[PDB]
Write a protein that binds this DNA or RNA. Structure first.
Ligand SMILES: [Cl-]
Ligand SMILES: [Cl-]
Ligand SMILES: [Cl-]
Ligand SMILES: [Cl-]
Ligand SMILES: [Cl-]
Ligand SMILES: [Cl-]
Ligand SMILES: [Cl-]
Ligand SMILES: [K+]
Ligand SMILES: [Mg+2]
Ligand SMILES: [Mg+2]
Ligand SMILES: [Mg+2]
Ligand SMILES: [Mg+2]
Ligand SMILES: [Mg+2]
Ligand SMILES: [Mg+2]
Ligand SMILES: [Mg+2]
Ligand SMILES: [Mg+2]
Ligand SMILES: [Mg+2]
Ligand SMILES: [Mg+2]
Ligand SMILES: [Mg+2]
Ligand SMILES: [Mg+2]
Ligand SMILES: [Mg+2]
Ligand SMILES: [Mg+2]
Ligand SMILES: [Mg+2]
Ligand SMILES: [Mg+2]
Ligand SMILES: [Mg+2]
Ligand SMILES: [Mg+2]
Ligand SMILES: [Mg+2]
Ligand SMILES: [Mg+2]
Ligand SMILES: [Mg+2]
Ligand SMILES: [Mg+2]
Ligand code: NA
Ligand code: NA
Ligand code: NA
Ligand code: NA
Ligand code: NA
Ligand code: NA
Ligand code: NA
Ligand code: NA
Ligand code: NA
Ligand code: NA
Ligand code: NA
Ligand code: NA
Ligand code: NA
Ligand code: NA
Ligand code: NA
Ligand code: NA
Ligand code: NA
Ligand SMILES: [Sr+2]
Ligand SMILES: [Sr+2]
Ligand SMILES: [Sr+2]
Ligand SMILES: [Sr+2]
Ligand SMILES: [Sr+2]
Ligand SMILES: [Sr+2]
Ligand SMILES: [Sr+2]
Ligand SMILES: [Sr+2]
Ligand SMILES: [Sr+2]
Ligand SMILES: [Sr+2]
Ligand SMILES: [Sr+2]
Ligand SMILES: [Sr+2]
Ligand SMILES: [Sr+2]
Ligand SMILES: [Sr+2]
Ligand SMILES: [Sr+2]
Ligand SMILES: [Sr+2]
Ligand SMILES: [Sr+2]
Ligand SMILES: [Sr+2]
Ligand SMILES: [Sr+2]
Ligand SMILES: [Sr+2]
Ligand SMILES: [Sr+2]
Ligand SMILES: [Sr+2]
Ligand SMILES: [Sr+2]
Ligand SMILES: [Sr+2]
Ligand SMILES: [Sr+2]
Lengths: 132, 142, 172, 160, 337
RNA sequence: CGCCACACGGGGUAAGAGCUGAACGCAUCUAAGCUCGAAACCCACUUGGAAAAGAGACACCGCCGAGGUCCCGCGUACAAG
RNA sequence: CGAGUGGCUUGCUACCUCGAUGUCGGUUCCCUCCAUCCUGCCCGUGCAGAAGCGGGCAAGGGUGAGGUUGUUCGCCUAUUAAAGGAGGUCGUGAGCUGGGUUUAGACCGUCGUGAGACAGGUCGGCUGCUAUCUACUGGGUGUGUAGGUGUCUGACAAGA
RNA sequence: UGUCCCAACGUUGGGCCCGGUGAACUGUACAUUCCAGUGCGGAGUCUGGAGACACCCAGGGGGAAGCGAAGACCCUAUGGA
RNA sequence: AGCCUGUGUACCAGGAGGGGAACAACCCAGAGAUAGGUUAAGGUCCCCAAGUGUGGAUUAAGUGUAAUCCUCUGAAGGUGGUCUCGAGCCCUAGACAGCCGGGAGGUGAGCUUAGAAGCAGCUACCCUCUAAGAAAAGCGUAACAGCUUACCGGCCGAGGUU
């Protein structure tokens, strides 16, 4: 993928439960897999800011609940490093459901998003209210 | 560094194994032998099969070790050792009375031992020790 | 057996050891003709290829040495020439001789130029869509010609559709 | 079942049907092919397939080789061509298999095979000088389906 | 089904034993291209700090933007090329032929060597030039040593000696180039060899950790879950199969870890100056203060503070040189805190 | 869990693409000869390595004194050594 | 239908071992094989392209995480370039585990007049030892080469 | 929630060095081995090669089909209970 | 099956010594002590005693350098790799191959068909010119065209073909 523009310490693994920062009807997401990733023996697959992931809906509306969907990580508690050396971290871990073309399924995003993610996924950004 | 050889052998265009055999025989009889122009010694056969055999010897080994020589210098010296009871007193004495050289470090020319000469005009299927060494990865210092 | 080749008047052939050198107004060529028990020599105004052995393998090489020598005679006099034509469909192919090698640009629309180094004292003259490879040594000339053609080889797609490339048009 | 199990003559002759029951039927469809209403004398050419080693040939092999042989003759000379071919051997030797360890191992009956000494004619065809190369090609196919190497020997036929 | 997994640790840096010379020894040199020149220099590690640089890379989306980069500060005072050794090519490889020494020696070079009192610089030169005429001359190297005394933070006064190859141009020309340097007094500087922005390979003897177990030394796992409470926590499962009936040298075991020679490739030189611009408030921890000739290497360098590190023009650079990077800031903030 | 660094290029081949070329007047990539061609082979690079028994090379110092040991203050080192 | 190679499965034999060579599965750690799953380079195509399908050279490197089950195998899920197979006493208990198998307690079904059984199921149920030799990982002292200091060479050896 | 990803740093007692005290297990012999082979088919000792200068310290336990118990399983005995 | 179970015999068991790398029963050999000599099996380039023996041929794969065998594999099938022996036919009235030239008229046969003209199918398959030349052997065309084979001649010059 296109360079992210920041160094990321993945703060999530397969099985992590995260916030769904949109209005798709899904409230909580469970990380199932990480796009393009391949680990090593005994390593739990990890994901962080900017990664595209496959998820299953843990909490939300009946219709969304249990559906296996694609998403993009927009916020994470573990710090990331920017070119100027400064570390940046968020209040929670969150992702945004997205389709085959990487367009957000929802109409609105909830909470801030990291600029780095905004740059990589434009249509996702053109849905954000706050870009940090 | 000065080897008082009673005999100087010229291995150029000479079948390695045949020279090695006569040299081992002489060393056991008390002769101090210097083999010269080892890089030009020769070994008959199909180059590709000969090389495979020497490469296999290089690949063999383990912790106990199977240090096989790559230079024509050592290849030839080893060929001679295999014709001497180098682990017996008399055998090690003979072996240590033999030395092989790249080129000719002496002023005298070496003699060509009878029955060891190869005729290039009559043979095309053979290889040079120097060619083997280069293939093995040796540093062509000659 | 033995075969005698009368050397042309335009030509003069010398030879030391296993190497034979042939010189003419078109240049010179030197080759090594080494095979077990086959003696090649220049006896006056003739070249002699002989052997005491007459088995199939020996006869094979003798016949091979003859043609090599007759070819050398021809090369130093008449010379050797291969003709080539550059064909292309969509992307115009730029073929130029730069230094000791022939460079081909925009082949199939590629950004990276393809190239090969000319062999020996072979000459490669290009005129529009036509190429002419020539020289005294048929080996070097034949290879350079072949090399140019091979240089536009494609294994990835159907050749019946993608035919761009330079092809040997005339063989000497 | 592999032929390696029965190709050799390493057992007594076992043919007596008065002391053997349950013998499977032979898979050999015919022993006389071509025009059997005609004599072999009426032909200029006679070619045989000679077995080069002594062996046992299971009826399943005789049928495969014979079939692939005659099959070719039919496809080249016609379902009525002017030729005739004979499979002169019959599978008299009954075979067993011990299919309980080595205890009371005398095997149950499982088939039949023909014993053939090296140099014998397994098949023999009779044709016209024309179809001589067709019968030779039929045998090439036949010997590819029987254990031993064979010779394609031409008997009457001086049209070389 | 027993998943695959690469082995633990590399088999290319063995045996993992204590280094023989604390002073690094390059086993390879740059190729001959430019004009003659000494292919290396040396200094003493002081510590680290960071700097803000203007992105240099022309292919980087950030070209022309601020960028914080970690740097290790190395004190690189002038050294003394005290002699010129010639090598001859022999059937057994290269061998020292002779040496051409000087007269002017640093006041304390005698803490390591028996300094020459009587030497013939021309006889030596003579023999060397004849070797070249004969065509038996192998590369040319300078015997070099440091001047620890010029570095206060380093207790040591005893100079560290190392041979450094001279390459570039024609042998005749670089031979004369070599004699030139030596004869002066051999005094040369970091400036005479490297320019900020070029890539250098740095070699040094890593920090010593004494005896360490397989987990730390080879990176093998610790025993897991229930297997961690039975009496084994940091021991590998087994030393090998039933057969072969022996322990292979390839299974990870305990032993010396650290104090090994390492040659780190492609270290970008951020800046070569002199003075105390890079020194840190309160002083580099466990070192002292810098105020003299220094070099700023991008990133990390093997060895603890005070160890001798060696520089050599990169022998396998991956990137073209982007000379004299613009430095907009050099942190002088205390390293304690 | 953080940060830094970890080629490009040569050489010889396999399968394969070809050149010249007989045996076999032709044809033929092969029989002799040759041009190419793999993450693979060798070199390149890193690490160890005078106990390599052919047990190595160079320079200087010293044989009434060069150098070294004990001793003492200490760690860039360290389980003893 | 015919001819073979292997020694991963199963069967057969009773050659070795009953004054004991501890079992299955898993785990950890190391080496290997190629009949190649991916990666490199090729040939063919019912090869336009993209992609498939089949074939060749090739063992450098890689071949991962999870749900049921003691399971091996396998079924299943999402990832992946691919998520290949096999040998090393079915590598590995003087390394681990003890779920399964495989004592002594107990229950069910079936069988047995009964004691009791079952190549069925089920709950519980113990893992000793200070390393002599050898092997290897690292560390020293001596002898040999034959006064000292400093600098090197590079036969060999290891690497993905 | 360090069971795990994936391991880190630290604490106390040992371990290591020194004074004193001071056992046991085990021992046909020889014994620096490694790769193959052979052999009652599972060899440090036989055969062929390879490697191997002696001694010592620490280590984790690959091998000595390691030590510890005249196999508990299975069969056999004109055995026992 | 280094399996099970007979039979005759010699061997191991209970049999040394020599050879077979090692190796109960494969080879020589049956053996008091000691000594000289000559052989046996097996071997004679070196390790290791004796040949780098002689006349001759084949093999280029390191095939092989392996009597027997749990132990030494190598099969069906295939081979213009190479050597040797034989049979038939053709040939200096010029063979085999290559190259050059000619490959022609009635007539695009008849039939079928809108059409088919060597070459969709069916039937026939005849004669002029001539040194040859099909009622056409293989591609090719919507059908023609076009390209070659047959067949004849030329250049060449010695074996060729089955
Ligand atoms: Cl996953
Ligand atoms: Cl080794
Ligand atoms: Cl010996
Ligand atoms: Cl030859
Ligand atoms: Cl574990
Ligand atoms: Cl007797
Ligand atoms: Cl060989
Ligand atoms: K037992
Ligand atoms: Mg696991
Ligand atoms: Mg700090
Ligand atoms: Mg701070
Ligand atoms: Mg038994
Ligand atoms: Mg393969
Ligand atoms: Mg495709
Ligand atoms: Mg491998
Ligand atoms: Mg298994
Ligand atoms: Mg096991
Ligand atoms: Mg064990
Ligand atoms: Mg245990
Ligand atoms: Mg224990
Ligand atoms: Mg249970
Ligand atoms: Mg009870
Ligand atoms: Mg239980
Ligand atoms: Mg045990
Ligand atoms: Mg008992
Ligand atoms: Mg019992
Ligand atoms: Mg009783
Ligand atoms: Mg007895
Ligand atoms: Mg002798
Ligand atoms: Mg062989
Ligand atoms: Na040979
Ligand atoms: Na080796
Ligand atoms: Na314990
Ligand atoms: Na075990
Ligand atoms: Na290459
Ligand atoms: Na088999
Ligand atoms: Na297990
Ligand atoms: Na591989
Ligand atoms: Na599972
Ligand atoms: Na076992
Ligand atoms: Na246990
Ligand atoms: Na187990
Ligand atoms: Na903890
Ligand atoms: Na052990
Ligand atoms: Na007897
Ligand atoms: Na013997
Ligand atoms: Na062989
Ligand atoms: Sr002799
Ligand atoms: Sr039988
Ligand atoms: Sr057959
Ligand atoms: Sr150095
Ligand atoms: Sr080195
Ligand atoms: Sr426990
Ligand atoms: Sr073993
Ligand atoms: Sr090829
Ligand atoms: Sr030494
Ligand atoms: Sr026992
Ligand atoms: Sr293979
Ligand atoms: Sr592939
Ligand atoms: Sr199952
Ligand atoms: Sr199993
Ligand atoms: Sr395993
Ligand atoms: Sr249990
Ligand atoms: Sr069960
Ligand atoms: Sr039960
Ligand atoms: Sr000694
Ligand atoms: Sr211990
Ligand atoms: Sr001879
Ligand atoms: Sr002979
Ligand atoms: Sr066996
Ligand atoms: Sr056999
Ligand atoms: Sr065969």
């Amino acid at each position: 993928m296109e360079a992210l523009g920041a160094d990321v310490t993945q703060g999530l693994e397969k099985g992590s439960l995260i916030t769904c920062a949109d209005n798709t009807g899904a409230r909580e997401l469970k990380v199932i897999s990480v796009h393009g990733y391949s680990g090593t023996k005994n390593r739990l697959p990890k994901a962080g800011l900017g990664d595209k992931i496959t998820v299953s809906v843990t909490k939300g509306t009946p219709e969304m609940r249990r559906q296996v969907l694609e998403a993009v990580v927009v916020r994470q508690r573990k710090p990331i490093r920017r070119p100027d050396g400064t570390r940046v971290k968020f209040e929670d871990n969150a992702a945004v459901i997205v389709d085959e073309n990487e367009d957000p399924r929802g109409t609105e995003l909830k909470g801030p998003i990291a600029r780095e993610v905004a740059q990589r996924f434009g249509s996702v950004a053109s849905a954000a209210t706050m870009i940090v | 560094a000065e080897f008082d050889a009673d005999v100087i052998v010229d291995a150029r265009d000479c079948i390695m194994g045949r020279v090695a055999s006569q040299v081992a025989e002489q060393a056991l009889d008390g002769e101090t032998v210097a083999v010269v122009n080892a890089e030009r010694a020769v070994i008959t056969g199909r180059e590709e099969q000969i090389v495979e055999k020497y490469e296999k010897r290089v690949d063999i080994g383990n912790d106990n070790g199977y240090f096989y020589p790559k230079r024509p210098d050592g290849i030839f010296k080893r060929t001679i050792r295999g014709m001497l009871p180098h682990k017996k007193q008399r055998g090690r004495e003979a072996f240590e009375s033999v030395r092989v050289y790249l080129g000719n470090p002496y002023d005298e020319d070496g003699e060509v031992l009878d029955g060891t000469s190869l005729d290039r005009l009559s043979n095309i299927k053979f290889v040079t020790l120097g060619e083997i060494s280069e293939t093995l990865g040796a540093n062509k210092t000659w | 057996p033995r075969v005698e080749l009368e050397i042309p008047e335009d030509v003069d052939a010398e030879q030391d050891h296993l190497d034979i050198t042939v010189e003419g107004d078109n240049g010179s060529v030197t080759r090594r003709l080494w095979y077990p028990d086959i003696d090649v020599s220049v006896d006056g105004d003739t070249v002699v290829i002989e052997s005491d052995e007459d088995n199939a393998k020996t006869m094979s090489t003798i016949g091979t040495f003859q043609s090599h020598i007759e070819n050398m005679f021809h090369g130093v006099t008449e010379g050797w020439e291969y003709g080539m034509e550059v064909f292309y469909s969509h992307f115009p192919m730029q073929v130029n001789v730069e230094g000791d090698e022939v460079v081909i640009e925009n082949f199939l629309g590629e950004k990276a130029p393809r190239r090969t180094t000319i062999h020996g004292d072979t000459d490669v003259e290009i005129d529009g869509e036509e190429l002419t490879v020539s020289g005294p040594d048929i080996e070097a000339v034949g290879q350079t010609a072949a090399d140019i053609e091979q240089l536009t080889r494609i294994n990835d797609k159907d050749v019946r559709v993608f035919q761009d490339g330079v092809y040997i048009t005339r063989k000497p | 079942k592999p032929a390696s199990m029965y190709r050799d003559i390493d057992k007594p002759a076992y043919t007596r049907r008065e002391y053997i029951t349950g013998i499977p039927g032979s898979k050999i469809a015919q022993h006389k092919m071509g025009r059997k209403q005609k004599d072999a004398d009426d032909y200029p050419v006679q070619i045989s397939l000679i077995v080069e080693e002594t062996v046992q040939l299971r009826h399943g092999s005789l049928e495969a080789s014979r079939l692939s042989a005659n099959r070719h003759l039919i496809k080249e000379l016609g379902e009525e061509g002017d030729y005739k071919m004979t499979l002169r051997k019959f599978p008299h030797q009954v075979l067993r298999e011990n299919k309980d360890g080595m205890r009371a191992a005398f095997g149950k009956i499982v088939g039949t095979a023909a014993r053939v000494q090296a140099g014998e004619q397994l098949f023999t065809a009779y044709c016209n000088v024309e179809d001589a190369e067709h019968v030779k090609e039929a045998f090439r196919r036949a010997y590819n389906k029987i254990t031993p190497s064979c010779r394609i020997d031409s008997s009457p036929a001086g049209n070389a | 089904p027993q998943p695959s997994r690469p082995r633990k640790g590399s088999l290319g840096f063995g045996p993992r034993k204590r280094s023989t010379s604390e002073t690094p020894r390059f086993n390879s040199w740059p190729s001959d291209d430019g004009q003659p020149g000494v292919q290396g220099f040396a200094g003493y590690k002081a510590g680290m700090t960071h700097v803000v640089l203007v992105n240099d890379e022309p292919n980087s989306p950030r070209e022309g933007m601020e960028e914080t980069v970690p740097v290790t500060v190395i004190e690189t005072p002038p050294m003394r090329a005290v002699a010129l050794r010639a090598y001859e090519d022999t059937p057994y490889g290269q061998r020292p032929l002779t040496e051409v020494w000087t007269d002017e020696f640093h006041s304390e070079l005698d803490r390591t060597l028996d300094v020459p009192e009587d030497h013939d610089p021309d006889a030596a030169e003579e023999q060397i030039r004849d070797a070249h005429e004969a065509g038996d001359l192998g590369d040319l190297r300078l015997i070099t040593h440091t001047v620890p005394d010029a570095v206060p933070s380093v207790p040591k006064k005893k100079p560290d000696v190392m041979e450094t190859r001279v390459g570039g141009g024609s042998v005749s020309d670089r031979l004369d180039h070599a004699l030139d340097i030596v004869e002066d007094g051999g005094e040369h500087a970091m400036n005479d060899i490297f320019r900020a922005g070029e890539y250098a390979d740095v070699a040094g003897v890593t920090k010593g950790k004494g005896t360490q177990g397989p987990v730390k030394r080879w990176g093998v796992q610790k025993r897991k879950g229930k297997h961690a409470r039975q009496g084994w926590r940091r021991r590998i499962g087994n030393l090998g199969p039933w057969n072969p009936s022996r322990v292979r040298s390839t299974v990870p075991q305990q032993g010396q870890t650290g104090y090994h020679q390492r040659t780190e490739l492609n270290k970008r030189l951020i800046d070569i100056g002199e003075g105390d611009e890079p020194t840190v408030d309160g002083g580099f921890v466990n070192y002292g203060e810098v105020d003299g000739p220094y070099t700023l290497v991008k990133g990390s360098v093997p060895g603890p503070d005070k160890r001798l590190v060696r520089f050599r023009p990169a022998v396998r650079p991956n990137d073209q040189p982007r000379l004299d990077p613009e430095v907009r800031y050099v942190s002088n903030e205390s390293n304690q805190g």
